[PDB]
Design a protein around this ligand. Sequence first.
Ligand SMILES: *[C@@H]1O[C@H](CO)[C@@H](O[C@@H]2O[C@H](CO)[C@@H](O[C@@H]3O[C@H](CO[C@H]4O[C@H](CO)[C@@H](O)[C@H](O)[C@@H]4O)[C@@H](O)[C@H](O[C@H]4O[C@H](CO)[C@@H](O)[C@H](O)[C@@H]4O)[C@@H]3O)[C@H](O)[C@H]2NC(C)=O)[C@H](O)[C@H]1NC(C)=O
Ligand SMILES: *[C@@H]1O[C@H](CO)[C@@H](O[C@@H]2O[C@H](CO)[C@@H](O[C@@H]3O[C@H](CO[C@H]4O[C@H](CO)[C@@H](O)[C@H](O)[C@@H]4O)[C@@H](O)[C@H](O[C@H]4O[C@H](CO)[C@@H](O)[C@H](O)[C@@H]4O)[C@@H]3O)[C@H](O)[C@H]2NC(C)=O)[C@H](O)[C@H]1NC(C)=O
Ligand SMILES: *[C@@H]1O[C@H](CO)[C@@H](O[C@@H]2O[C@H](CO)[C@@H](O[C@@H]3O[C@H](CO[C@H]4O[C@H](CO)[C@@H](O)[C@H](O)[C@@H]4O)[C@@H](O)[C@H](O)[C@@H]3O)[C@H](O)[C@H]2NC(C)=O)[C@H](O)[C@H]1NC(C)=O
Ligand SMILES: *[C@@H]1O[C@H](CO)[C@@H](O[C@@H]2O[C@H](CO)[C@@H](O)[C@H](O)[C@H]2NC(C)=O)[C@H](O)[C@H]1NC(C)=O
Lengths: 48, 120, 49, 112
Amino acid sequence: TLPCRIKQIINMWQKVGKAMYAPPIRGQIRCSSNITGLLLTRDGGSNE
Amino acid sequence: QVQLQQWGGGLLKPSQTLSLTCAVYRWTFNDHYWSWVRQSPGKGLEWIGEISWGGATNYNPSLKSRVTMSVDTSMSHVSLKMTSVTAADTGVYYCVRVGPGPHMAALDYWGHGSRVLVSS
Amino acid sequence: GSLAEKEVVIRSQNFTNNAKVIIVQLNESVVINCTRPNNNTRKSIHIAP
Amino acid sequence: DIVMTQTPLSSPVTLGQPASISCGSSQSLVHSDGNTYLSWLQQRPGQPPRLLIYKISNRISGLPDRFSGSGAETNFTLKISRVEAEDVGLYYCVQGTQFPWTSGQGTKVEIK
Ligand SMILES: *[C@@H]1O[C@H](CO)[C@@H](O[C@@H]2O[C@H](CO)[C@@H](O[C@@H]3O[C@H](CO[C@H]4O[C@H](CO)[C@@H](O)[C@H](O)[C@@H]4O)[C@@H](O)[C@H](O[C@H]4O[C@H](CO)[C@@H](O)[C@H](O)[C@@H]4O)[C@@H]3O)[C@H](O)[C@H]2NC(C)=O)[C@H](O)[C@H]1NC(C)=O
Ligand SMILES: *[C@@H]1O[C@H](CO)[C@@H](O[C@@H]2O[C@H](CO)[C@@H](O[C@@H]3O[C@H](CO[C@H]4O[C@H](CO)[C@@H](O)[C@H](O)[C@@H]4O)[C@@H](O)[C@H](O[C@H]4O[C@H](CO)[C@@H](O)[C@H](O)[C@@H]4O)[C@@H]3O)[C@H](O)[C@H]2NC(C)=O)[C@H](O)[C@H]1NC(C)=O
Ligand SMILES: *[C@@H]1O[C@H](CO)[C@@H](O[C@@H]2O[C@H](CO)[C@@H](O[C@@H]3O[C@H](CO[C@H]4O[C@H](CO)[C@@H](O)[C@H](O)[C@@H]4O)[C@@H](O)[C@H](O)[C@@H]3O)[C@H](O)[C@H]2NC(C)=O)[C@H](O)[C@H]1NC(C)=O
Ligand SMILES: *[C@@H]1O[C@H](CO)[C@@H](O[C@@H]2O[C@H](CO)[C@@H](O)[C@H](O)[C@H]2NC(C)=O)[C@H](O)[C@H]1NC(C)=O
């Protein structure tokens, strides 16, 4: 499992100066989705 | 460790509609399917139907024209609606967890059972 | 997203450029189940007209 | 529209004496995957039915070692190696394999 935190004020797209508040759902939310790909970076080479 | 709380109409007049609800306290509705089983000892345990998260259902064909099932996922509720109730529908109505065929093909976590009487 | 056909692909822009993203498309798929196991209620507060 | 019937209506057994419940189906209980499915439940007087044995002979963890079973197609049996007072109640032979599921009438195991 991945422990998860919940957040309501979202600084969408880093548009600093504006933010969205997400009102709460009625309750008991469960969802599922498909993982189809990953965004990865490689550690850059060090000065070794 | 799945729990169930159930309640509903335990007394109906003939030709009325039965409404029974079970609350699920641990999971979603596609982890296992929920089904309704009615005890009426001459027939043992009679299957009424089962319903999944997606609203997919399988009904006992003899009740196809009388029974409706639905799931309210936000309230974690399994709901059975049976129209035109008769004396033959008197019995104990259980919500049961249905495991996958390939896993166990078995019925567990039975609720205590709603006691439903149909009478004048 | 769409799934990789046949097998996994990497598709980086430049592997020798350390400041780059690697966009990996996976074969088949992985299913993830997310829950917020809390039963809430709603309030509505009149804050301004 | 498969009919499941249990052979005994009841079976008084003294304590420590073995007992068995045979049952069967009007149609072989063989699924599309080639497996045979049936299940056994037991109900106590103030309790809902509960599972004891799944598929034909598989034990649930926590089941007493006293319980076992076997069978195929249309002819199945639940067995108790020694019947204890705690094993008293209604045993049900459940169809398992097809959607319009039925079960037998309930066999009452009693102490003789
Ligand atoms: C995300 O993923 C996690 C990780 O899997 C899920 O959490 C698990 O949920 C299951 C289901 O409730 C838990 O499984 C159960 O564990 C019980 C063990 O606890 C008792 O016994 C121990 C001693 O062994 C005591 O110390 C403890 O206090 C308890 O008394 C088992 O007993 C349960 O099985 C029983 O019922 C079945 C029903 O058919 C019988 O077949 C069994 O024989 C037995 O009688 C059951 O196995 C599991 O422990 C949880 N894991 C963790 C790490 O917490 C999340 O639910 C999931 N979330 C989502 C959204 O998917
Ligand atoms: C793409 O990724 C998202 C996550 O980012 C996945 O997660 C959610 O998946 C669900 C299911 O596909 C999305 O849709 C919601 O389904 C709820 C359950 O529907 C039942 O009832 C309908 C009746 O027509 C049946 O067809 C269905 O099979 C179920 O039995 C609905 O209750 C939701 O309703 C919305 O509108 C009502 C209006 O009254 C609101 O009250 C609800 O709160 C809600 O807004 C909805 O239809 C859900 O949208 C996905 N989440 C997000 C954020 O998008 C997807 O599954 C995944 N898809 C794929 C193909 O991979
Ligand atoms: C999340 O919140 C939901 C509400 O927003 C919850 O749903 C509610 O659940 C209660 C459960 O009690 C229903 O209240 C009443 O329940 C009684 C039944 O209780 C009595 O009888 C039983 C035997 O059948 C006995 O065991 C009990 O101890 C009591 O003596 C009914 O008779 C009443 O008619 C009524 O249903 C609420 O009605 C229901 N709300 C809604 C909108 O349906 C939900 O349970 C919460 N938690 C979750 C999903 O985890
Ligand atoms: C996750 O992937 C599965 C499998 O690809 C999707 O479900 C099925 O997809 C096939 C096509 O490959 C369709 O023919 C089936 O009809 C689909 N079945 C269902 C129930 O949708 C699935 O939709 C994808 N997304 C999620 C959230 O599960």
